Amino acid sequence: ADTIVAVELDSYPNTDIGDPNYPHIGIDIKSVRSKSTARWNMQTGKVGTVHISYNSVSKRLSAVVSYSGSSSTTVSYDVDLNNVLPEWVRVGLSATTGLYKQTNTILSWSFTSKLKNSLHFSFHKFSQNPKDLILQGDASTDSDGNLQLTKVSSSGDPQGNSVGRALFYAPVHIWEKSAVVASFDATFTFLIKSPDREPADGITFFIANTDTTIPSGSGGRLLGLFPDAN
Amino acid sequence: ADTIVAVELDSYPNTDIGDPNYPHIGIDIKSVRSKSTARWNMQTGKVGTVHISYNSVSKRLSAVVSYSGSSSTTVSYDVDLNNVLPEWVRVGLSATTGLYKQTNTILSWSFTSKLKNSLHFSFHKFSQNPKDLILQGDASTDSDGNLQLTKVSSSGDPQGNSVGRALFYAPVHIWEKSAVVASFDATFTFLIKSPDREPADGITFFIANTDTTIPSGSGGRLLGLFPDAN
Amino acid sequence: ADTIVAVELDSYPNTDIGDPNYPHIGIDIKSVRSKSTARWNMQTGKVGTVHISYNSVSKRLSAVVSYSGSSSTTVSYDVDLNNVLPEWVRVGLSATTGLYKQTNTILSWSFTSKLKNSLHFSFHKFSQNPKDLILQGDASTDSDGNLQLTKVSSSGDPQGNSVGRALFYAPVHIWEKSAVVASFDATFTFLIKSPDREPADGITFFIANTDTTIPSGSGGRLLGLFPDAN
Amino acid sequence: ADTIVAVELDSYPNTDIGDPNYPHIGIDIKSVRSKSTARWNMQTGKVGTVHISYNSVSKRLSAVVSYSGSSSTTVSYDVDLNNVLPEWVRVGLSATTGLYKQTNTILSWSFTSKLKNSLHFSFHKFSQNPKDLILQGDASTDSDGNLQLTKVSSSGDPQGNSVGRALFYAPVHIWEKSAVVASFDATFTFLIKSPDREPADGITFFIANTDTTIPSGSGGRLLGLFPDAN
Numbered sequence: 001a002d003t004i005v006a007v008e009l010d011s012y013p014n015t016d017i018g019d020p021n022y023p024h025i026g027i028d029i030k031s032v033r034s035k036s037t038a039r040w041n042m043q044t045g046k047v048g049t050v051h052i053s054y055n056s057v058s059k060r061l062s063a064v065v066s067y068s069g070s071s072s073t074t075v076s077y078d079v080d081l082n083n084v085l086p087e088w089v090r091v092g093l094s095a096t097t098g099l100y101k102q103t104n105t106i107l108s109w110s111f112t113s114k115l116k117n118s119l120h121f122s123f124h125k126f127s128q129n130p131k132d133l134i135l136q137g138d139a140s141t142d143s144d145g146n147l148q149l150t151k152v153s154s155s156g157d158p159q160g161n162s163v164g165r166a167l168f169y170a171p172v173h174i175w176e177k178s179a180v181v182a183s184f185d186a187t188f189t190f191l192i193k194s195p196d197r198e199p200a201d202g203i204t205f206f207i208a209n210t211d212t213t214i215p216s217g218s219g220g221r222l223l224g225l226f227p228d229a230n
Numbered sequence: 231a232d233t234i235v236a237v238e239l240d241s242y243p244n245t246d247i248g249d250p251n252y253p254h255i256g257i258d259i260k261s262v263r264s265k266s267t268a269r270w271n272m273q274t275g276k277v278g279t280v281h282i283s284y285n286s287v288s289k290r291l292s293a294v295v296s297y298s299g300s301s302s303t304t305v306s307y308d309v310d311l312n313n314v315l316p317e318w319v320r321v322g323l324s325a326t327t328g329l330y331k332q333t334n335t336i337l338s339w340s341f342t343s344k345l346k347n348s349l350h351f352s353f354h355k356f357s358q359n360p361k362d363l364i365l366q367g368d369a370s371t372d373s374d375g376n377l378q379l380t381k382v383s384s385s386g387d388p389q390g391n392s393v394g395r396a397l398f399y400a401p402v403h404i405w406e407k408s409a410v411v412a413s414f415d416a417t418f419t420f421l422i423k424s425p426d427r428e429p430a431d432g433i434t435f436f437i438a439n440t441d442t443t444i445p446s447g448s449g450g451r452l453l454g455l456f457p458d459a460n
Numbered sequence: 461a462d463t464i465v466a467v468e469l470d471s472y473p474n475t476d477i478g479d480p481n482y483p484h485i486g487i488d489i490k491s492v493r494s495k496s497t498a499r500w501n502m503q504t505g506k507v508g509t510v511h512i513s514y515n516s517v518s519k520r521l522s523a524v525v526s527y528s529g530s531s532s533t534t535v536s537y538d539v540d541l542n543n544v545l546p547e548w549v550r551v552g553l554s555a556t557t558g559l560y561k562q563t564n565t566i567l568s569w570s571f572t573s574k575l576k577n578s579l580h581f582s583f584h585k586f587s588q589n590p591k592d593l594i595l596q597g598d599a600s601t602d603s604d605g606n607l608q609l610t611k612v613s614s615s616g617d618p619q620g621n622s623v624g625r626a627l628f629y630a631p632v633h634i635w636e637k638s639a640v641v642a643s644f645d646a647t648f649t650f651l652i653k654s655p656d657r658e659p660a661d662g663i664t665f666f667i668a669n670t671d672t673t674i675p676s677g678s679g680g681r682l683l684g685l686f687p688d689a690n
Numbered sequence: 691a692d693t694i695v696a697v698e699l700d701s702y703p704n705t706d707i708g709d710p711n712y713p714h715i716g717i718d719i720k721s722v723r724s725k726s727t728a729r730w731n732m733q734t735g736k737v738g739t740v741h742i743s744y745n746s747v748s749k750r751l752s753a754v755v756s757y758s759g760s761s762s763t764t765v766s767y768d769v770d771l772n773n774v775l776p777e778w779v780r781v782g783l784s785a786t787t788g789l790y791k792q793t794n795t796i797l798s799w800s801f802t803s804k805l806k807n808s809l810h811f812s813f814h815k816f817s818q819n820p821k822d823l824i825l826q827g828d829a830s831t832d833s834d835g836n837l838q839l840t841k842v843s844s845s846g847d848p849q850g851n852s853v854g855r856a857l858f859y860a861p862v863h864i865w866e867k868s869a870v871v872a873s874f875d876a877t878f879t880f881l882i883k884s885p886d887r888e889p890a891d892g893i894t895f896f897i898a899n900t901d902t903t904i905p906s907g908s909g910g911r912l913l914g915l916f917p918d919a920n
């Protein structure tokens with residue numbers, strides 16, 4: 001199956017598969033059961049920002065989520081991604097909804113990779129036909145230039161049981177055997193609105209094998225990334 | 231047929247079809263018959279460097295070729311590429327040999343585009359299997375990490391009647407209806423060695439429609455870019 | 461006297477020293493009387509954006525001003541800036557008021573120089589004590605993180621007969637004898653509000669000798685750059 | 691006294707003041723007695739490369755030293771620089787010799803810093819009179835465009851008992867009250883030649899209070915950074 005590394009903004013506590021009993025950000029290494037989590041003070045209706053970083057000498061993957069004026073949540077995990085990921089990968093964003101729902105709106109996205117070659121892209125607006133994105137599932141761009149990862153209505157209300165992803169078109173070379181150091185950094189901003197008492201399910205930035213696709217049965221709590229909850 | 235904009239390093243004068251009667255650099259807008267040329271101050275067997283720039287406010291496409299800072303050649307052409315290229319393009323390098331030949335060896339390649347969105351890539355080495363490149367024709371990477379656009383013997387001798395290109399995998403968004411300014415910059419370094427008194431044929435950097443392919447009959451003098459010499 | 465290259469956003473027509481009789485953007489080379497101008501559709505109270513670019517192979521200095529949802533104004537001038545500028549410079553922003561007035565509020569500023577060596581800075585907020593800026597005249601930063609080039613009261617009301625500049629602290633190496641190409645790009649966003657029927661005087665981005673200071677007599681129509689109107 | 695954070699490339703084991711008994715790289719937090727070290731297979735006469743990285747979320751400072759076709763040396767250390775350094779710093783390079791000696795030749799240096807505002811500089815050659823560096827002590831640039839941190843003769847032969855440093859002219863803003871994440875990355879390439887059987891003393895990259903100067907008594911084993919060995 002696919003090989004997945006991800007940072008999850010997990011809106012809904014699925015304590016039956018190991019989630020903590022609160023909204024959380026987490027670091028997922030080949031399993032939906034995060035190797036490290038931190039409590040996330042989710043704020044419906046406000047734009048948030050996530051920053052993600054990794055360095056192969058440090059061997060530490062880190063993420064921070066924040067909102068204007070409010071305080072930040074951070075999570076880190078010690079890992080050597082070279083013992084986890086292949087040499088070439090793709091990078092993307094995923095989101096799901098399930099029985100409960102929320103908008104999974106992406107307002108901007110940037111990524112930089114360096115191998116010692118380099119790759120850098122940034123979107124502050126998404127076009128009507130983003131030919132540099134591989135859109136999977138229900139993901140689509142709307143009339144305002146925003147990336148709606150899961151289905152939203154004509155008037156802006158989210159739908160349940162929706163899944164979608166967006167991958168950057170070009171593969172990324174993140175290691176080699178003559179390699180001295182590799183790094184990446186990513187940023188995205190997002191807007192989550194929900195009519196539900198308990199919004200669900202979440203948003204991820206993830207890194208996978210180049211031929212990755214939405215797995216069978218990855219809806220809801222599995223965030224469009226994993227085929228099961230092992 | 232493809233839509234083509236290129237900067238050509240034309241080592242062999244094909245007066246047949248409008249080449250000036252000397253090795254030259256040129257700017258090609260939808261034709262092999264350059265809109266602007268300059269006599270090429272060459273140094274065969276030395277590493278040369280090419281810098282290409284364009285800005286949609288200035289409406290000026292420019293290139294400089296130099297050899298370790300010496301022996302400079304420049305060419306420029308006033309043009310609004312918005313009325314020439316489609317909104318989404320691919321960018322790449324091409325080269326050919328013909329009856330006469332030369333190595334068409336790329337040692338590095340970088341490109342940056344900004345729309346007001348941005349894309350930047352840079353290769354100081356080419357891997358044995360570059361998954362972020364679309365290799366076409368005879369193009370390949372060798373054991374020293376160099377990109378050989380045309381065929382070279384296992385001992386380094388160039389072969390004749392060869393054609394090859396390398397395209398960056400992801401499409402590039404160069405214009406948009408509400409655009410204020412768009413720009414791009416490209417750099418590459420090359421090594422041309424030849425056993426012939428009259429080496430041939432040349433190297434280009436080019437921009438094209440995303441689905442561009444080597445046209446039939448585009449070898450030698452046509453630089454792997456055009457179907458005919460109109 | 462200093463040596464000045466500047467892009468001016470001139471809100472007030474001073475027809476006795478060569479201004480066209482409307483608000484205009486212009487390119488200034490060692491004189492307040494612009495080498496090139498374009499009619500500027502000035503919109504008080506709306507945030508504007510300026511992009512400026514130069515390449516030494518193209519030899520074209522270009523600028524564009526725009527507002528969200530409105531048309532753009534562009535101006536260009538053909539020039540080899542190494543005939544005008546020293547090898548080392550400082551880059552900066554300037555603004556004035558006179559009998560009539562306006563706010564000269566800078567919200568963000570970025571600059572990139574490349575010498576084929578590079579320098580790049582970007583500010584999206586100015587700190588209360590910006591130790592990487594040389595503040596001259598009346599320039600200061602306010603509580604909102606904005607750079608007020610000319611004086612405003614505690615209520616935000618602009619004052620007349622004010623002059624102010626901000627220089628980036630580090631000298632920039634914009635030309636070098638071994639260089640094959642030199643380039644720079646600059647962007648700023650600005651907010652000009654005014655209670656006057658004819659607001660005045662203007663904002664510039666400029667490049668000057670490293671020890672540039674506000675010349676005596678440079679108020680008002682001279683934009684804080686020039687000692688006279690020759 | 692100054693406040694110093696440094697990455698040391700230490701050629702000479704001074705075991706009386708805490709050095710391991712072999713050449714080593716180390717991370718120095720307000721003391722020459724490194725908080726973390728790694729054994730360094732130093733190779734005189736070959737160009738080496740150092741990459742340094744830090745991110746305020748991961749809170750890990752790391753460094754890697756490599757030569758062409760050799761194994762790398764890595765060192766890391768967990769630290770929150772917000773508790774160590776002031777908000778505004780200068781960044782620089784230092785080197786010493788003592789009774790024993792070596793060339794401390796810097797061929798290139800680059801630095802990037804981001805605060806969530808950004809600063810980036812890169813030198814692949816140094817000017818013979820660099821107006822954007824603060825040179826201290828014996829440091830100077832030569833006619834080849836290399837930065838000689840310690841003295842060399844007309845012949846290129848290094849001198850003993852030398853100390854020199856080079857700081858980038860612009861202060862850097864590495865933290866603030868409302869900061870969410872700060873990061874930096876640095877690279878330099880160096881050539882250490884020596885005629886001595888035990889070369890000495892070393893090279894550093896360092897971050898300090900903006901007004902830092904060479905401390906009295908900082909020669910030799912104190913690397914031009916510290917006044918004592920506590």
Ligand SMILES: OC[C@H]1O[C@H](Oc2c[nH]c3ccc(Br)c(Cl)c23)[C@@H](O)[C@@H](O)[C@@H]1O
Pocket residue numbers: 012014097098099100101200201219220221222
């Ligand atoms: O969207 C939130 C969740 O909705 C569903 O889970 C349930 C939430 N409340 C329930 C009540 C009953 C049953 Br049966 C189920 Cl599966 C659920 C499932 O779709 C989950 O995967 C998802 O995380």
Ligand SMILES: OC[C@H]1O[C@H](Oc2c[nH]c3ccc(Br)c(Cl)c23)[C@@H](O)[C@@H](O)[C@@H]1O
Pocket residue numbers: 242244327328329330331429430431449450451452
């Ligand atoms: O490599 C140089 C050139 O060689 C060929 O053209 C010829 C130039 N002189 C000739 C002489 C004989 C024959 Br057959 C041919 Cl095809 C040619 C063709 O391959 C040209 O397209 C190419 O530019």
Ligand SMILES: OC[C@H]1O[C@H](Oc2c[nH]c3ccc(Br)c(Cl)c23)[C@@H](O)[C@@H](O)[C@@H]1O
Pocket residue numbers: 472474557558559560561660661679680681682
């Ligand atoms: O701010 C707009 C202008 O005001 C002044 O010039 C005048 C414009 N209208 C006037 C009317 C009367 C007198 Br006195 C003066 Cl100095 C002026 C001067 O300060 C000019 O430098 C400036 O351009």
Ligand SMILES: OC[C@H]1O[C@H](Oc2c[nH]c3ccc(Br)c(Cl)c23)[C@@H](O)[C@@H](O)[C@@H]1O
Pocket residue numbers: 702704787788789790791890891909910911912
């Ligand atoms: O450059 C190498 C070393 O030389 C000096 O230390 C000595 C090393 N071996 C010695 C032998 C004799 C005497 Br006296 C001295 Cl100072 C030393 C001192 O300068 C040290 O700080 C330095 O690290």
Ligand SMILES: [Ca+2]
Pocket residue numbers: 010011012013014019201202221
């Ligand atoms: Ca969950």
Ligand SMILES: [Ca+2]
Pocket residue numbers: 240241242243244249431432451
């Ligand atoms: Ca030809």
Ligand SMILES: [Ca+2]
Pocket residue numbers: 470471472473474479661662681
């Ligand atoms: Ca005026």
Ligand SMILES: [Ca+2]
Pocket residue numbers: 700701702703704709891892911
């Ligand atoms: Ca030592």
Ligand SMILES: [Mn+2]
Pocket residue numbers: 008010019020024026032034
């Ligand atoms: Mn979870």
Ligand SMILES: [Mn+2]
Pocket residue numbers: 238240249250254256262264
């Ligand atoms: Mn030609």
Ligand SMILES: [Mn+2]
Pocket residue numbers: 468470479480484486492494
């Ligand atoms: Mn004017």
Ligand SMILES: [Mn+2]
Pocket residue numbers: 698700709710714716722724
């Ligand atoms: Mn030591």
